[PDB]
Amino acid sequence: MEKVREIVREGIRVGNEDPRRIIHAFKVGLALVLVSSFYYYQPFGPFTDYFGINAMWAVMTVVVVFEFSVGATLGKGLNRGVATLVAGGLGIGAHQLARLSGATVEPILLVMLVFVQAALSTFVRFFPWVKTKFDYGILIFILTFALISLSGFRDEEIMDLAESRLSTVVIGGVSCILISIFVCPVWAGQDLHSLLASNFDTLSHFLQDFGDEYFEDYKVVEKRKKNLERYKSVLDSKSDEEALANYAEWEPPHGQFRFRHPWKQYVAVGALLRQCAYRIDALNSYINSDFQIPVDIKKKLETPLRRMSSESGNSMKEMSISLKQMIKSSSSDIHVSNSQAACKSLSTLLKSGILNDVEPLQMISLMTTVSMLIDIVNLTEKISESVHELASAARFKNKM
Amino acid sequence: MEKVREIVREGIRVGNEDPRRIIHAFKVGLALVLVSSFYYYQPFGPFTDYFGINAMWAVMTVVVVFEFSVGATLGKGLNRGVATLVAGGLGIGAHQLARLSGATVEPILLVMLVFVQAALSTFVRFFPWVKTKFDYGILIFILTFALISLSGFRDEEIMDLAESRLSTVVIGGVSCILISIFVCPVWAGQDLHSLLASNFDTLSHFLQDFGDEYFEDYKVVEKRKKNLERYKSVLDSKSDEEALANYAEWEPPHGQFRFRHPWKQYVAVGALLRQCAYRIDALNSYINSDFQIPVDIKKKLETPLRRMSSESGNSMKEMSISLKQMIKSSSSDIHVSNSQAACKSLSTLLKSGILNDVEPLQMISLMTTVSMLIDIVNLTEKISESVHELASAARFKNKM
């Protein structure tokens, strides 16, 4: 049980994190049973079934194609479909050519043609473009060509083999797509939105908590995690955005995400958020440092830093709220202009030379924090306007 | 041609970048032909071949298993093997149970058992551990179980189906592994080393070029790229290290990488390098800023910054050189101790209060750069000792 206790604790962890994993776990079985039921009771027309494997290949297709998102299954399905089709055309042709050649030189030319096309496709699988969109496609290309040709089958049982494999791929993939679209869908574009909104939320949290904390047993450790991992989640979430983007470019236009939709913008805004998290990471590194500033000097500058920090955090919150609800807004304008005014005020206060009573090491630490905050304000401005452009160029809801 | 000109330019780009992609492109075809040649001319013993698909499944295995690295193919091959074996045991058993049940309630219990095991395995495919090591394994588990059972085959043609699919998977995978190991190998551990060494190299370059540049039409843009992307390559190279690590934990102990080898250390050193690149990124952001410091004040502090920058860069170069050749060294010691001395010297020079002639905005910029450099020195110390521990705990060549 002790290993079983371990596994059930981790299983229920993954469970309560997200129930859609459970619903999808059932969707797979539902699609499998649906397909096998189609092939047991022929609904209207019994096919050739010349080899007796139609059911085997339909189930192999369904297991291999079905993925989590809706775009993912749509992509694996479309790739598998078109790839098997074209590879079938070429396989039929090449085997006809081989029959044309001779009787003892048939296998040798079959070998030659398989070698050439397999080598060339494998080398195409190292491009960047194909690697991001259609690696499974080129895989099935190689697979199906060598499947059709190099099979030790007579010259007459190929005109049927291709149609068998092709029709099976079609019907299996279509079952997977329809189940995934119309049972309890899991769209990737929506997940990308909520991921973006989670990033913005976490940053706003840190900014407020910083405006509180920079001027103050095991609970220290709880708060340490409450600061560290909260933002660090943004730093290690670049491949996930990049993946949800590739999947989301396949989806069909559902409820609120119209057809021509700008995902590349979502990844660009991702990059900007990543830079803001770099800066925040430096700030946090100072919060948990060893050389520590006397509180009085930081209190000498509490005020403008307070405004800048709090107002940047409010602006991030406004962007998150306006995005997670796909609603259009303009509160970011005032909540960023206030921070600009606070920045110029801070510059003027620095012009007063009030810092002429401090040892320069403390000057190192304090001026570092000042610079980090200033850079964050500027980046928040750019993010604000970029997100504003994104929303406008996507037809968000101007109802407010 | 114009699209073809486009594609040939990109093809030759990917080509000249790395020729091992071409050699591997040929390795795939060589393995395919080898397998089909085995199944055409039975070398010693003709199998049952009761269904006429042994060649089809052998080629499907070879195309699907073969990957770039050596660890990758070894992993996909081992997963496919053990998974098909265990799934075969269960499929045989369950179909016997179904025969035990009845005659018209056979398909229903078959359905039930497939549903249960498929659903459970799909839900196991959401763990973290299984997701990093054996996702293909659980995939083939589901695949082969439903393949064996839900196939519309009589109760007597299963004792042969399992052995057919299993022996085919074995022989195909073994051909792929042997070709990939003994033709012109592409190890993943070696790639991880050279990736690490490339990271260290790029950082050293930036440090030297910074010690030159911080105190100075289209050529500005060439140098801008020569600074930006050089280090930015380290920032977006976390998933690649993480992937080469998973692949490298499968490889067999070849020439210089002994059996028990510490890859997790290579990823940890990766994380530390990533932090150093964060700092460097802030430095570069200041280099390309708009508000610009008058040169004279920076010249007031050129000297200790010069030593610190140059010596950290030299220390990084020493680590890279000692690692890329798997040779052991101790030049890092002196080349880091010199930087420590320079840091204390800089602190003392700051104690002279020489900075009492500067407007505090310039103080913001200058103290920011000072702090970045100091933090980089400290991180370089930690990286130095961590890499030193790594080398020692891996038995590097103490010949110098």
PDB file of N, CA and C in Angstrom, chain B residues 298-328:
ATOM      1  N   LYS B 298      31.869  57.632 -16.254  1.00  0.00           N
ATOM      2  CA  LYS B 298      32.206  56.223 -16.409  1.00  0.00           C
ATOM      3  C   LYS B 298      33.713  56.028 -16.419  1.00  0.00           C
ATOM      4  N   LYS B 299      34.441  56.960 -17.034  1.00  0.00           N
ATOM      5  CA  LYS B 299      35.895  56.903 -16.993  1.00  0.00           C
ATOM      6  C   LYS B 299      36.412  57.051 -15.572  1.00  0.00           C
ATOM      7  N   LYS B 300      35.664  57.743 -14.712  1.00  0.00           N
ATOM      8  CA  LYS B 300      36.075  57.834 -13.317  1.00  0.00           C
ATOM      9  C   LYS B 300      36.114  56.472 -12.642  1.00  0.00           C
ATOM     10  N   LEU B 301      35.384  55.490 -13.164  1.00  0.00           N
ATOM     11  CA  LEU B 301      35.321  54.168 -12.555  1.00  0.00           C
ATOM     12  C   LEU B 301      35.781  53.061 -13.497  1.00  0.00           C
ATOM     13  N   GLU B 302      36.361  53.412 -14.644  1.00  0.00           N
ATOM     14  CA  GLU B 302      36.749  52.409 -15.631  1.00  0.00           C
ATOM     15  C   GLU B 302      37.584  51.283 -15.023  1.00  0.00           C
ATOM     16  N   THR B 303      38.536  51.621 -14.153  1.00  0.00           N
ATOM     17  CA  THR B 303      39.588  50.660 -13.806  1.00  0.00           C
ATOM     18  C   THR B 303      39.064  49.422 -13.075  1.00  0.00           C
ATOM     19  N   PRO B 304      38.457  49.534 -11.896  1.00  0.00           N
ATOM     20  CA  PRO B 304      38.065  48.298 -11.199  1.00  0.00           C
ATOM     21  C   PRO B 304      37.016  47.519 -11.961  1.00  0.00           C
ATOM     22  N   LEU B 305      36.100  48.217 -12.629  1.00  0.00           N
ATOM     23  CA  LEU B 305      35.152  47.540 -13.501  1.00  0.00           C
ATOM     24  C   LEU B 305      35.876  46.801 -14.610  1.00  0.00           C
ATOM     25  N   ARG B 306      36.928  47.408 -15.155  1.00  0.00           N
ATOM     26  CA  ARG B 306      37.704  46.734 -16.185  1.00  0.00           C
ATOM     27  C   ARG B 306      38.241  45.409 -15.669  1.00  0.00           C
ATOM     28  N   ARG B 307      38.883  45.425 -14.500  1.00  0.00           N
ATOM     29  CA  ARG B 307      39.435  44.187 -13.954  1.00  0.00           C
ATOM     30  C   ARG B 307      38.344  43.156 -13.717  1.00  0.00           C
ATOM     31  N   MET B 308      37.263  43.555 -13.044  1.00  0.00           N
ATOM     32  CA  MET B 308      36.211  42.605 -12.695  1.00  0.00           C
ATOM     33  C   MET B 308      35.617  41.966 -13.939  1.00  0.00           C
ATOM     34  N   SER B 309      35.209  42.791 -14.899  1.00  0.00           N
ATOM     35  CA  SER B 309      34.634  42.273 -16.129  1.00  0.00           C
ATOM     36  C   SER B 309      35.596  41.324 -16.825  1.00  0.00           C
ATOM     37  N   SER B 310      36.816  41.790 -17.093  1.00  0.00           N
ATOM     38  CA  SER B 310      37.745  40.989 -17.874  1.00  0.00           C
ATOM     39  C   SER B 310      38.080  39.687 -17.168  1.00  0.00           C
ATOM     40  N   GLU B 311      38.213  39.717 -15.847  1.00  0.00           N
ATOM     41  CA  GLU B 311      38.637  38.512 -15.149  1.00  0.00           C
ATOM     42  C   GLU B 311      37.496  37.513 -15.015  1.00  0.00           C
ATOM     43  N   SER B 312      36.264  37.990 -14.826  1.00  0.00           N
ATOM     44  CA  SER B 312      35.139  37.065 -14.885  1.00  0.00           C
ATOM     45  C   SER B 312      35.049  36.408 -16.248  1.00  0.00           C
ATOM     46  N   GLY B 313      35.239  37.183 -17.315  1.00  0.00           N
ATOM     47  CA  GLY B 313      35.217  36.598 -18.643  1.00  0.00           C
ATOM     48  C   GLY B 313      36.315  35.573 -18.844  1.00  0.00           C
ATOM     49  N   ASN B 314      37.502  35.848 -18.309  1.00  0.00           N
ATOM     50  CA  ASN B 314      38.582  34.878 -18.409  1.00  0.00           C
ATOM     51  C   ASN B 314      38.253  33.611 -17.640  1.00  0.00           C
ATOM     52  N   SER B 315      37.607  33.750 -16.484  1.00  0.00           N
ATOM     53  CA  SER B 315      37.261  32.575 -15.698  1.00  0.00           C
ATOM     54  C   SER B 315      36.231  31.721 -16.417  1.00  0.00           C
ATOM     55  N   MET B 316      35.225  32.357 -17.012  1.00  0.00           N
ATOM     56  CA  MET B 316      34.278  31.607 -17.822  1.00  0.00           C
ATOM     57  C   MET B 316      34.975  30.904 -18.975  1.00  0.00           C
ATOM     58  N   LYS B 317      35.940  31.566 -19.617  1.00  0.00           N
ATOM     59  CA  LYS B 317      36.659  30.917 -20.707  1.00  0.00           C
ATOM     60  C   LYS B 317      37.409  29.694 -20.212  1.00  0.00           C
ATOM     61  N   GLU B 318      38.024  29.791 -19.034  1.00  0.00           N
ATOM     62  CA  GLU B 318      38.743  28.646 -18.491  1.00  0.00           C
ATOM     63  C   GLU B 318      37.813  27.485 -18.204  1.00  0.00           C
ATOM     64  N   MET B 319      36.632  27.758 -17.657  1.00  0.00           N
ATOM     65  CA  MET B 319      35.687  26.676 -17.422  1.00  0.00           C
ATOM     66  C   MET B 319      35.270  26.030 -18.731  1.00  0.00           C
ATOM     67  N   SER B 320      34.966  26.846 -19.738  1.00  0.00           N
ATOM     68  CA  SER B 320      34.558  26.301 -21.026  1.00  0.00           C
ATOM     69  C   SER B 320      35.648  25.429 -21.617  1.00  0.00           C
ATOM     70  N   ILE B 321      36.890  25.905 -21.574  1.00  0.00           N
ATOM     71  CA  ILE B 321      37.990  25.165 -22.183  1.00  0.00           C
ATOM     72  C   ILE B 321      38.237  23.864 -21.432  1.00  0.00           C
ATOM     73  N   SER B 322      38.221  23.918 -20.102  1.00  0.00           N
ATOM     74  CA  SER B 322      38.414  22.701 -19.326  1.00  0.00           C
ATOM     75  C   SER B 322      37.286  21.702 -19.528  1.00  0.00           C
ATOM     76  N   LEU B 323      36.082  22.161 -19.849  1.00  0.00           N
ATOM     77  CA  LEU B 323      34.973  21.237 -20.021  1.00  0.00           C
ATOM     78  C   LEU B 323      34.882  20.661 -21.426  1.00  0.00           C
ATOM     79  N   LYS B 324      35.042  21.493 -22.457  1.00  0.00           N
ATOM     80  CA  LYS B 324      34.845  21.042 -23.832  1.00  0.00           C
ATOM     81  C   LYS B 324      35.866  19.982 -24.214  1.00  0.00           C
ATOM     82  N   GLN B 325      36.963  19.911 -23.472  1.00  0.00           N
ATOM     83  CA  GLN B 325      37.973  18.899 -23.717  1.00  0.00           C
ATOM     84  C   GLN B 325      37.979  17.826 -22.644  1.00  0.00           C
ATOM     85  N   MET B 326      36.990  17.835 -21.751  1.00  0.00           N
ATOM     86  CA  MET B 326      36.891  16.888 -20.643  1.00  0.00           C
ATOM     87  C   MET B 326      38.189  16.780 -19.857  1.00  0.00           C
ATOM     88  N   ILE B 327      38.954  17.862 -19.794  1.00  0.00           N
ATOM     89  CA  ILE B 327      40.230  17.895 -19.090  1.00  0.00           C
ATOM     90  C   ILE B 327      40.022  18.609 -17.766  1.00  0.00           C
ATOM     91  N   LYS B 328      40.801  18.236 -16.758  1.00  0.00           N
ATOM     92  CA  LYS B 328      40.671  18.862 -15.448  1.00  0.00           C
ATOM     93  C   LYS B 328      41.669  20.010 -15.336  1.00  0.00           C
TER      94      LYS B 328
END
